[PDB]
Symmetry: C4
Subunit: 274 residues, 4 copies
């Protein structure tokens, strides 16, 4: 029999967290990742769940996530270490029948608990499930370096920020045609920042936390990591261009419109209008 550590989802969590560590996006415990699973994903491994159950209440009831299993990163845990000890740094949790709390079925050994950003994660999963008819399955947060730097210089406005990111790499509009939501700075690890993030997730797959980092949503680990990597790559280009004194030329509005038409996407109107 297959060890749960060799499962597609444990291996995928290891790959995404390790890749993000190597990118320089996740110093110390700066990042968190949650992946929504099906019962059918974890059923073959149920002898691993065979447990003195651990139950933890949610800060807010989440009835839409009733009975739903997730694999999640732990509070205070380092992305760098996930590859070294998956069961210490990751846990499989299942939200209970009423959405009032969850059991820790596997992992998060030695009294570890899920990420302190669980509200932002679970509330965003809720909104993304509604927004995508259940197709989005991943919420990823990291401290993407160039995106963070840009939050000190670009206006903290969805249209302006989205438009610069679209201009800074051709495929950006195709990968995130709904653009990038941006919050004011907020104290992290709170219900409030969770709820503010989730409200932006209704209309965007990416949300920026100024002076902090980024949240992304997608259907798979690779597509979510790739979404963030695309925005961060554009941010990296922009930081270089702005450091050289700014753009002498760029992708025009008309060109962005043509791009959207070709790829069958409706670009965020506010960003396109600039």
């Amino acid at each position: 029999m297959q060890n749960i550590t060799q499962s597609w989802f444990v291996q995928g969590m290891i790959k995404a967290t390790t890749d993000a560590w190597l990118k320089g996006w996740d110093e110390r415990n700066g990042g968190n990742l949650t992946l929504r699973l099906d019962d059918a994903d974890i059923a073959p491994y149920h002898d691993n769940f065979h447990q003195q159950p651990r139950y933890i209440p949610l800060s807010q009831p989440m009835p839409l996530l009733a009975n739903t299993p997730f694999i999640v990163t732990g509070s205070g845990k380092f992305f760098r270490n996930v590859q070294l000890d998956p069961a210490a740094n990751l846990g499989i949790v299942k939200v209970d029948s009423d959405g009032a709390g969850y059991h820790i079925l596997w992992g998060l050994t030695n009294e570890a608990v899920p990420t302190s950003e669980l509200p932002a994660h679970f509330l965003s999963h809720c909104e993304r499930i509604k927004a995508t008819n259940g197709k989005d399955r991943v919420i990823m947060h990291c401290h993407a370096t160039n995106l963070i730097a840009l939050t000190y210089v670009l206006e903290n406005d969805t249209a302006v920020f989205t438009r610069q990111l679209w201009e800074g790499s051709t495929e950006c509009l195709v990968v995130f045609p709904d653009g990038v939501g941006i919050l004011p700075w907020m104290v992290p690890g709170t219900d409030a920042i969770g709820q503010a993030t989730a409200q932006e997730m209704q209309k965007h797959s990416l949300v920026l936390w100024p002076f902090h980092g980024v949240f992304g949503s997608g259907p798979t680990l690779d597509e979510t990591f790739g979404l963030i990597d695309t925005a961060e790559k554009s941010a990296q280009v922009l930081v270089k261009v702005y450091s050289m004194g700014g753009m002498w030329q760029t992708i025009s509005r008309e060109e962005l419109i043509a791009l959207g038409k070709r790829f069958g996407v409706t670009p965020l109107a506010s960003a396109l209008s600039l």
Copy 2:
């Protein structure tokens, strides 16, 4: 018997795509690579081709590529993943007797198809075969970070851009004496951008897509990767120099002329004249 995955060409595709991933040039699916093979390369592996054939028509007939096999990266596929599952992310294709389409002989599993930039690739192979009497065998596209940044600041002009790249690392003129072609921004994944790229490939081994990336051509995977790496290294130096306020000194015209003479190359006259 040798598995096809251990072949020189599958191993080479893995090395080039993995190296480019590690460079930060190929976020998400941002990049594509095609390598022209001989019948003699794939003949020893023909039991791997033993197939429910898949046939796909080309958007434009390419009679010059009749009967020609290639190994290619897939549409929507991540350079990061090639090492993890070569058969999922790569395919061996063979253009048919008339050049009207190709069979997928191996790989591109689960209904995967070749890169969306196949026109730019195949049309460029055609022009490079003519330009080099059949010596060029590789077309590589990636999202080379500093080259991209420079397209927002340097004039989008072959002579000017070539000349700065030559100045930004001594060996540039020796590695690409024909210089760098540069298109206007165009909607990607089209016949039009393919044909525009191929027309520049007649007179240059490197072609820039502003605000997007670079295409390179060469006789081997290493020489093509190395060509791009050289241009991108010069671009990296230039981005640093421009960020520091610009050049106080540089390689002179006379010095570039002397360099060309020593290495027995005829540098692009327009770039040399500046």
Copy 3:
């Protein structure tokens, strides 16, 4: 029986030094690391200590460290090489009953000796033991690139430097609420620089050596590495922002105060007052 090289502490020293090498923080011999152990940590491995003893006097008596074992990096040794030959590059030392010197129990083969920055390390351990009621166990020095660059541009003042680092990544105030001490430039490898560093370690977990690097203290290798990585990440963001012409917006004083309250930390008053 377990080889000492497979011990948690030898493996941890290898991980931290290798990670720091990969970060670009430790060119040549530029860095040093010391970890305070318990007798119980090394007792299971005592057959490895079975030795023609080597004894080296300390430059200054350190009675508070009497009888205390440490694992340490060697003088003139490369962080890059620790993974290749742990016993050549690391040593287990034990401070004697009076604190007048130490024995080299294991490692530092071929007449190697502990780091030339041993005074800064051991004196800082002393002050951190007092400051944290024995909870801090690690002193790490490296040449963190962006922190070094910032010492040429930011005022060399604890309040100003701390405040910018807090602003450059949200979690900074939470990770180092006591802020960052900063010395004037001093000749390294001396008792004087050791004593100056230790005096700052009384009131901060991080101390900057202008035009040189950083010292950090924490309870574990990961928490100490993570502390430095956090400060250096903020420094990296700031270098990008300053290169783009400076901040247009940032985390406010009020926001920093709110952050401190939420995380139950008392931020350094001088930095908070700006």
Copy 4:
């Protein structure tokens, strides 16, 4: 019996070239490395030399290197590939009794030849042998990115350039107290550039080729790589500082003098006088 590929010197060449590749210093074939061996180093492996000899004349007789064996990188070879096929990319050569040429005893398979920069290497070895009473054994050339960028902005003057590098990391004066020689731009791969480099090697362990790269000399692979890594790290810091608008404070002349005194080195007078 030990394969020659497992020898200390083949393994060391692999480590240095691979490390330099990972640094981004050696795109394409941009770099070369030569290590002077003793007869006693290669004697245990002589059954590997058992050969249809290959002999190649030197461009200039080098009687001081008579009978001397070296391990060297090949012309047109990629540092990236050394780890994949050491015998293809490296060769063991022995200069003949008169210094008129050398035999290729091992490696450089498929008619490969030593680096095109052999004059710069061998002539520099000659001068460094004289300068250090035979202690220096390595000449390394690479395309160190930040050092290259600085050659477009700093005055191309030994005193000025040395002084900035000393200021940009404290240990620089200790690692290269003799400073950094700097040539005018010259056509590479020539006897002339070789002889110009060697003349600077009489009085410095580092020599800059503007708009091209750096040459370094030292007693071991690690000390030579570390020398270059130190200068390049300082260059990296300086590029960041200059990009942020320049130094507000720095290491003073008096401080550099104090540093030299403490470490028992005589710093280059011209650089110290600024």
